[PDB]
Design a protein around this ligand. Structure first.
Ligand SMILES: O=C(O)[C@H]1O[C@@H](O[C@H]2[C@H](O)[C@H](O)[C@H](O[C@H]3[C@H](O)[C@H](O)[C@H](O[C@H]4[C@H](O)[C@H](O)[C@H](O)O[C@@H]4C(=O)O)O[C@@H]3C(=O)O)O[C@@H]2C(=O)O)[C@@H](O)[C@@H](O)[C@@H]1O
Ligand SMILES: O=C(O)[C@H]1O[C@@H](O[C@H]2[C@H](O)[C@H](O)[C@H](O[C@H]3[C@H](O)[C@H](O)[C@H](O[C@H]4[C@H](O)[C@H](O)[C@H](O)O[C@@H]4C(=O)O)O[C@@H]3C(=O)O)O[C@@H]2C(=O)O)[C@@H](O)[C@@H](O)[C@@H]1O
Lengths: 380, 380
């Protein structure tokens, strides 16, 4: 039975079991994943402090990125204040190194951590550990446990909490740190430092004005707030809070965003309405992977108001078959492959066979290097 | 009378004329422009050499970018060779610093060069000169006269010339070096080295395999190649070569790329078909600013087969009024504002009053700092 963590635990245990018994098709797939995982062993650990332009704190260990849809105002002399253009990503985002580096980190330690759980090879814990220590707890290189300057906007006068959503890239790595516990590379002291970091980040999440703000959001930000919350709380083994967050926060939030016809009106008014409809569910989906490890199924539990998350999958299912039939603003192409894991997650949770079959018909590439697909041999 | 170069010389002469007569509307507009132009006086000059990852020649003076629509292949262990996704910019392009720095350089030298022509103030030639010397001729910081490594593609086996289209960013600034001739800051030695650089770049363009191959390209690449050629040749005062290039290369390219109904079929097969129809026409417009300064109107001059460039504007004009009407693949929203300069340039050259009226009805913002709109007070 897998440690509590941010993954489909049924598929991970199934993979580890078959790999130990020497079943050939799982053993071949894991030997692929080990070839894929080799660049993370050579890859030098990244730090939030690899940046030139510092945040207002003057502190390089503070995480700072730019809110992606905010651009200079050409009609102003300084371009300040930035204006918003929904869905159009400002390439200035790439001048903030943590934006892409936390992705690269998150992929590398998630991959290495799942490979060590499946295979038990110490090489994968030892390397996962180097990445975790450097990003999180190192006294010089580790990131301060807050998101004060996440998605900061030049010229903006009020403090915003919208940037918190960025935390999902390293919070999954926090969760999978549970999978190297017991290895020789992950000493008791390393665990104590990280538990302390995770304790402080959770405190900031819950009590900062930006975190309180983001816990209250009425769209997909509030759903990703809680999915991140559960990852932190699961890493810390706080299962009573997980049940409390699931019953008092995620389900009422989920029910307030689902219209009568299953649509998500907060996302429909966006210029990337089909991307953000799917983004909302993806939060629920990663939340459910933790809640359902302790007996709570978020896809089928109805909210107080009678709305249930399956109604949202129903509304969107036809447009996963035929994304061109989408009748709302979508100013970029929508990646149909995102529907694969989503309909398989919700398909199994709901016992809907139409969903699981469409998940496999769309599929993921057998050989892909995208680490979030590592547990999904069943899709490949 | 304006020196030969890459700008609407009729509007530039009208602006310097009315600023000298003390007219209030232009004097106020030019004084807006001078406050926009202040940041370029202080701006430290950029170099092609400010990069870490070196080109295969190991020379930091060689320009190198990534071809924007080419992506790592996730089904390959190293992502190699890259595959093409038409219309989808790979944000890895921003890891090549010249991509955006040639834009910043070109904007600053062009803005400072036009402002020197209009106002005569020496501080604008001195600042323009600083940018020009560093980008082009400096013996350590200046860029080599070639585009060998422009839009390189990881894993690609053959040599390509597609990247030559990047040249339009610094070749407009080359042409504007003609406006600062005669200032105290552009010494005869500075002009010599630049003349020598431009002559060596012109050689590479016409005689390298990549330059030859790009000069014969069947789509908008061949038209932008000749627009860039006419900038280099106008800078070098080779006005008979301009007559030859227009008759022997631009006019056949037009005759073959405009179809009988006025569409640009090579641009209609792209995933951004309205953007690339406009991009081809934009190549003719910048080419035509140079040719019509020596009496050649590329909008109404027929190819050998009777086709004229105005038939291409005819085909698209309805869609410039209503881009939602556009019936071909266009996977990102088209920017209607590009039609202002375009419909204005085409409309005056052809005496089409329906084009000029529509240009001003679309308009440009009076205080925008986009440097290419400096001549177009008429649109503001
Ligand atoms: O590229 C990336 O980093 C990821 O982007 C992800 O999309 C996120 C963005 O990161 C932003 O946080 C974006 O913020 C939105 C809000 O969700 C919200 O719509 C807000 O709208 C306000 C608005 O600010 C204004 O005041 C108006 O008057 O009221 C609006 C309202 O309440 O409707 O605007 C914010 C903003 O643009 O700052 O939200 C999305 C999101 O997740 O919803 C995502 O695409 C991810 O996949 C990328 O990796
Ligand atoms: O972002 C920028 O840098 C600017 O991009 C401008 O669009 C340019 C691009 O910069 C590229 O140069 C792009 O290259 C294209 C070729 O035009 C051409 O279509 C080629 O087509 C081949 C293809 O390589 C492939 O093998 C396929 O199977 O066959 C094709 C065929 O049938 O011809 O593909 C090239 C490539 O992508 O490598 O071309 C465009 C362009 O047409 O100019 C522009 O958007 C500008 O505004 C940006 O600033």
């Amino acid at each position: 039975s897998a440690p509590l963590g941010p993954f489909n635990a049924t598929l991970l245990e199934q993979l580890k079991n078959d790999y130990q018994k020497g079943e050939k098709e799982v053993t071949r797939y894991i030997e692929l994943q080990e070839k894929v995982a080799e660049k993370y062993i050579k890859m030098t650990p990244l730090s939030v402090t690899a940046k030139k332009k510092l945040p207002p704190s003057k502190d390089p260990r503070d995480y700072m990125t730019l809110s992606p849809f905010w651009w200079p105002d050409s009609t102003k002399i300084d371009g300040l204040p930035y204006i918003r253009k929904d869905g159009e990503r400002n390439p200035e985002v790439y001048e903030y190194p943590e934006r892409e580096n936390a992705n690269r980190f998150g992929d590398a330690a998630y991959c290495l951590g799942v490979l060590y759980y499946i295979t038990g090879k110490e090489v994968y814990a030892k390397a996962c550990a180097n990445h975790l220590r450097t990003w999180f707890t190192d006294p010089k290189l580790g990131m301060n446990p807050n998101m004060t300057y996440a998605q900061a906007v030049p010229g903006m006068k009020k403090m915003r909490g919208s940037g918190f959503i960025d935390s999902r890239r390293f919070s999954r790595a926090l969760g999978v740190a549970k999978l190297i516990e017991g290895s020789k590379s992950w000493t008791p002291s390393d665990k104590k430092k990280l538990d302390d970091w995770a304790t402080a980040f959770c405190y900031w999440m819950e009590n900062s004005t930006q975190g309180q703000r983001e816990s209250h959001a009425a769209n997909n930000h509030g759903l990703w707030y809680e999915a991140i919350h559960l990852m932190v709380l699961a890493y810390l083994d706080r299962t009573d809070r997980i049940r409390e967050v699931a019953e008092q926060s995620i389900l009422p939030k989920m029910g307030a965003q689902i219209a009568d016809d299953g649509s998500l009106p907060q996302e429909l008014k966006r210029t990337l309405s089909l991307h953000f409809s799917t983004f909302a569910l993806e939060a629920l989906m990663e939340a459910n992977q933790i809640t359902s490890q302790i007996g709570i199924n978020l896809w089928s539990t109805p909210a107080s108001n009678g709305k249930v998350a399956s109604q949202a999958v129903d509304y969107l299912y036809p447009f996963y078959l035929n994304p061109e039939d989408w009748k709302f603003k979508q100013i970029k192409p929508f990646d149909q492959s995102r529907a694969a894991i989503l309909l398989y997650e919700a398909g199994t949770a709901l016992g809907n066979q139409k969903y699981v079959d469409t998940a496999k018909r769309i599929g993921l590439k057998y050989s892909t290097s995208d680490v979030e697909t590592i547990p999904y041999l069943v899709l490949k």
